[PDB]
Amino acid sequence: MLVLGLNGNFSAADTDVVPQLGEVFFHDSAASLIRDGELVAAVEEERLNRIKKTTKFPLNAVRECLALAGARPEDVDAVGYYFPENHIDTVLNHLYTEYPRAPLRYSRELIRQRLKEGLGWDLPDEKLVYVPHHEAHAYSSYLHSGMDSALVLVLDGRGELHSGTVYRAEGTRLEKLADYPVPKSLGGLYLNATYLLGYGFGDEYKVMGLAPWGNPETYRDTFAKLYTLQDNGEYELHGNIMVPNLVSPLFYAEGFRPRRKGEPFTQAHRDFAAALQETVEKIVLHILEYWAKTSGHSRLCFGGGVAHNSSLNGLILKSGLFDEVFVHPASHDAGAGEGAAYAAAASLGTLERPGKRLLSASLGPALGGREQIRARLADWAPLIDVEFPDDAVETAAGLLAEGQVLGWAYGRSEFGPRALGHRSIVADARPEENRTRINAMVKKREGFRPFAPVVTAEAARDYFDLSGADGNHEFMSFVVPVLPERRTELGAVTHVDGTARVQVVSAESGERFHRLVRRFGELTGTPVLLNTSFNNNAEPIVQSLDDVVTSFLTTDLDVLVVEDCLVRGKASPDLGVLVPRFRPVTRLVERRTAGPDASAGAKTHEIHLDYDGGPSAKVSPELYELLGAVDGTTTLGDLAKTVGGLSDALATEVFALWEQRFLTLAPAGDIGPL
């Protein structure tokens, strides 16, 4: 039994199903592969097409999953899709009424066209299974829990008919207990409020990071007008007929004005975030207080996008409502994609399930063999210096103890949003200053943002308060208190409220990363590291070796440790040897608007990424001419001849566009098949 799980929309690499298809239409595209009930490969398409939370069809993810399994497309017994057929087709039909030039291609045709054109795979209709969305979420969360019975809660933005569902789980059978309609969505509520802070889709976790800086008292009674807790685990959200946002009208009427980009986060912004987070905590704990005592289950599995609210999870852990809580590293729609495979298996035969709790999210493609990685790093020689230490982990722990900030790239990439020791940036967790600088200089993000620690399993309870239920901490699912007598010691990773979104690494969850953290603790007395995701502000978590080196070279990291190679940037790196490549969404434009006296205005030149929400940047006339000559094979230095040579100014302009990922800059060639 080999089964493919699919989620996302159906757009090709270079176009979308309709022009500028909204980023909210079936996002976080991913593919997962289960064999004999075990999750053998999973990767989000964003990692391969480099568009965060992408809606595009996860063609590359399917290809990578098959390769990791050693399978051909014909080996796949079934394909599950994470929504019912009528729902996804009704939404496509809606988009087609708005875009009368678009061909009437519904999901079955589009899935089969993509697999046929993209993989040479003729999928039989009888192998395609559409699955209720919250059923897919629940299967994913519960089957990886290691529990043989549980309460399973799913809360997300929405399924086909519900924003929340409660299941009883026993053996491999799911039995629905309750649901909550779409307009009560806590995902929708959190996103509605997120837009008031100058943030958008996908930024909710940043708002969660802001909330502990605020006092929930300021806006508590305002948010209380937007919901009512009702008897027997019910609740209500109070909508409005003014605009499609539950939150902005009332807060506008009370004088709250939405933050603008580039403005600071005031105390009122912080308090708003705090009152929002408390609101969702109050609702979910109300749901669970009721269903704990009603269903009688002492164990909980929590999935759906809302289960990525780690503060909420930490409160559930401390609530005492349950003895055990489990959360999957991919509780958003990539996990529903995985759950759709289990559901598809269930509908065609018997359901085979994992035999153990999931401990590792290291499930994507790896970086390559020993030899192909060494050969590819040689291709980067004009930009990097490379050492091959006898014991890279020993050396990396020493560098960390010396205050270096490291890129850390090993093996198979993490499924789900958290970096966990395979595509990480790590630093000493003790100095508070590391938080200040890694926010400001390395990740280039807001100073309020917290940093998550990783700790060895053996030392975890010396630093963090894990009391209450037994939660799984392999995937940073839970915020927990830092023990008070350790808060000064852990300056970089203790949040303003004394908590931390902890990763507890063990020899079984992540042997190499555990050894790193253990050795560091032996050197310093503190077996704790800061662990943030390996990506700059313009990209998802890095995937390939070229991704890793590119990111190292365009962030202000000290050293890169990749598959036991020690990489440093050269004193003067020769950008001219890099070959520019368009991304499938890269566009160049020369534009004139109207000018004075109805003249044609002055020319300007821009590069942009053609997808909804894509960035854009002004370019000089010389860079515009240089980039128009890009062929995929010629180096940047040879290209720059035609505009009179790669001046330092052109190299600097190119470097800034590289940092923002408007195009691919890498040595000639590639690493080859893995």
State the residues that interact with Cl ion by CB under 5 A: 175-176
Question: Binding residue for a second copy (CB under 8 A) from 74, 98, 125, 126?
Answer: 98
Tell me whether residue 69 or residue 161 sits nearer to Fe ion (CB atom): 161
CB 82 within 8 A of CB 140: no
Q: What residues contact 111, with CB distance under 8 A and at least 6 apart?
A: 6, 10, 57, 79, 81, 123, 128
Binding region: 26-27, 133, 137, 156-158, 187, 204, 305, 309, 333
Tell me whether residue 12 or residue 386 sits nearer to a second copy (CB atom): 12
Query: Per rule CB under 8 A, is residue 19 in the interface with a second copy?
Result: no
Binding region for ATP: 26-27, 157-158, 187, 204, 305, 309, 333
Total residues contacting a second copy by CB under 8 A comes to: 71
- If contact means CB under 5 to 8 A according to the sort of partner, which of Fe ion, Cl ion, a second copy, none does residue 333 touch? Fe ion
- If contact means CB under 5 to 8 A according to the sort of partner, which of a second copy, Cl ion, Fe ion, none does residue 242 touch? a second copy
- If contact means CB under 5 to 8 A according to the sort of partner, which of Fe ion, a second copy, Cl ion, none does residue 258 touch? a second copy
CB 309 within 8 A of CB 191: no
- If contact means CB under 5 to 8 A according to the sort of partner, which of a second copy, Cl ion, Fe ion, none does residue 323 touch? none
Query: Per rule CB under 8 A, is residue 87 in the interface with a second copy?
Result: yes
Query: Per rule CB under 8 A, is residue 638 in the interface with a second copy?
Result: no
From the CA atom positions of the chain, what is the Rg in Å? 25
Tell me whether residue 333 or residue 539 sits nearer to Fe ion (CB atom): 333
Query: Per rule CB under 8 A, is residue 97 in the interface with a second copy?
Result: yes
- If contact means CB under 5 to 8 A according to the sort of partner, which of a second copy, Fe ion, Cl ion, none does residue 381 touch? none
- If contact means CB under 5 to 8 A according to the sort of partner, which of Fe ion, a second copy, Cl ion, none does residue 615 touch? none
Residues 552-611 that bind a second copy (CB under 8 A): 581-601, 603, 610
String of DSSP letters for 50-115? --TT--S--HHHHHHHHHHHT--GGG--EEEESS-HHHHHHHHHHHHHH-TTS----HHHHHHHHH
Total residues contacting Fe ion by CB under 5 A comes to: 3
How far apart CA 213 and CA 218 sit, in angstroms, is 13
How far apart CA 52 and CA 39 sit, in angstroms, is 23
Question: Binding residue for Fe ion (CB under 5 A) from 333, 338, 428, 563?
Answer: 333
Binding region for AMP: 187, 204, 305, 309, 333
Residue 25: both structure tokens together: 């239409």
How far apart CA 198 and CA 646 sit, in angstroms, is 38
How far apart CA 601 and CA 591 sit, in angstroms, is 9
Query: Per rule CB under 8 A, is residue 255 in the interface with a second copy?
Result: no
Tell me whether residue 252 or residue 655 sits nearer to a second copy (CB atom): 252
Query: Per rule CB under 8 A, is residue 183 in the interface with a second copy?
Result: yes
- If contact means CB under 5 to 8 A according to the sort of partner, which of a second copy, Fe ion, Cl ion, none does residue 175 touch? Cl ion
- If contact means CB under 5 to 8 A according to the sort of partner, which of a second copy, Fe ion, Cl ion, none does residue 201 touch? none
Tell me whether residue 522 or residue 670 sits nearer to a second copy (CB atom): 670
Q: What residues contact 46, with CB distance under 8 A and at least 6 apart?
A: 28, 29, 52, 53, 54, 540
How far apart CA 518 and CA 393 sit, in angstroms, is 10
Q: What residues contact 660, with CB distance under 8 A and at least 6 apart?
A: 538, 615, 617
Nearest Cα residue to 463 out of 435, 505, 426: 505
Question: In the complex, what is the shortest distance from the CB of residue 340 to Fe ion, in angstroms, rounded to a whole number?
Answer: 11
Strand boundaries in 363-445, DSSP class E: 384-387, 406-409, 423-428
Question: In the complex, what is the shortest distance from the CB of residue 87 to a second copy, in angstroms, rounded to a whole number?
Answer: 7
Tell me whether residue 402 or residue 670 sits nearer to a second copy (CB atom): 670
The DSSP element (H or E) to which 569 belongs, if any, is strand 565-569
Query: Per rule CB under 8 A, is residue 371 in the interface with a second copy?
Result: no
Angle, in degrees to the nearest 10, between helices 648-659 and 545-554: 120
Q: What residues contact 264, with CB distance under 8 A and at least 6 apart?
A: none
- If contact means CB under 5 to 8 A according to the sort of partner, which of Cl ion, Fe ion, a second copy, none does residue 503 touch? none
Question: In the complex, what is the shortest distance from the CB of residue 563 to a second copy, in angstroms, rounded to a whole number?
Answer: 26
Grouping H, G, I as helix, E, B as strand and the rest as coil, residue 23 is coil
CB 663 within 8 A of CB 627: yes
Query: Per rule CB under 5 A, is residue 64 in the interface with Fe ion?
Result: no
Binding region for Fe(3+): 133, 137, 156, 333
Question: In the complex, what is the shortest distance from the CB of residue 195 to a second copy, in angstroms, rounded to a whole number?
Answer: 4
Nearest Cα residue to 184 out of 122, 106, 243, 237: 237
Tell me whether residue 200 or residue 403 sits nearer to a second copy (CB atom): 200
Binding span for a second copy by CB under 8 A among 41-49, 465-473, 563-571, 623-631: 623-631
Query: Per rule CB under 8 A, is residue 244 in the interface with a second copy?
Result: yes
Tell me whether residue 243 or residue 441 sits nearer to a second copy (CB atom): 243
How far apart CA 134 and CA 546 sit, in angstroms, is 37
Question: In the complex, what is the shortest distance from the CB of residue 188 to Fe ion, in angstroms, rounded to a whole number?
Answer: 12
Question: In the complex, what is the shortest distance from the CB of residue 92 to a second copy, in angstroms, rounded to a whole number?
Answer: 9
- If contact means CB under 5 to 8 A according to the sort of partner, which of Fe ion, Cl ion, a second copy, none does residue 259 touch? a second copy
How far apart CA 267 and CA 96 sit, in angstroms, is 44
DSSP state of 309: -
Query: For residue 468, how many other CB atoms are within 10 A of its CB?
Result: 19
- If contact means CB under 5 to 8 A according to the sort of partner, which of Cl ion, Fe ion, a second copy, none does residue 320 touch? none
Query: Per rule CB under 8 A, is residue 668 in the interface with a second copy?
Result: no
Residues 122-181 that bind Fe ion (CB under 5 A): 156
Contact flags string 203-242 toward a second copy, x per CB under 8 A:
--------------------------------------xx
Query: Per rule CB under 8 A, is residue 196 in the interface with a second copy?
Result: yes
Grouping H, G, I as helix, E, B as strand and the rest as coil, residue 651 is helix
- If contact means CB under 5 to 8 A according to the sort of partner, which of a second copy, Cl ion, Fe ion, none does residue 356 touch? none
Question: In the complex, what is the shortest distance from the CB of residue 175 to Cl ion, in angstroms, rounded to a whole number?
Answer: 4
Grouping H, G, I as helix, E, B as strand and the rest as coil, residue 177 is strand
Q: What residues contact 535, with CB distance under 8 A and at least 6 apart?
A: 423, 541, 542, 551
Convert 411-438 to b/e letters by CB count within 10 Å (16 or more is b). Answer: bbbbbbbbbbbbbbbbbbbbeeebbeeb
Question: Could you list the residues that contact Fe ion (CB under 5 A)?
Answer: 156, 333, 336
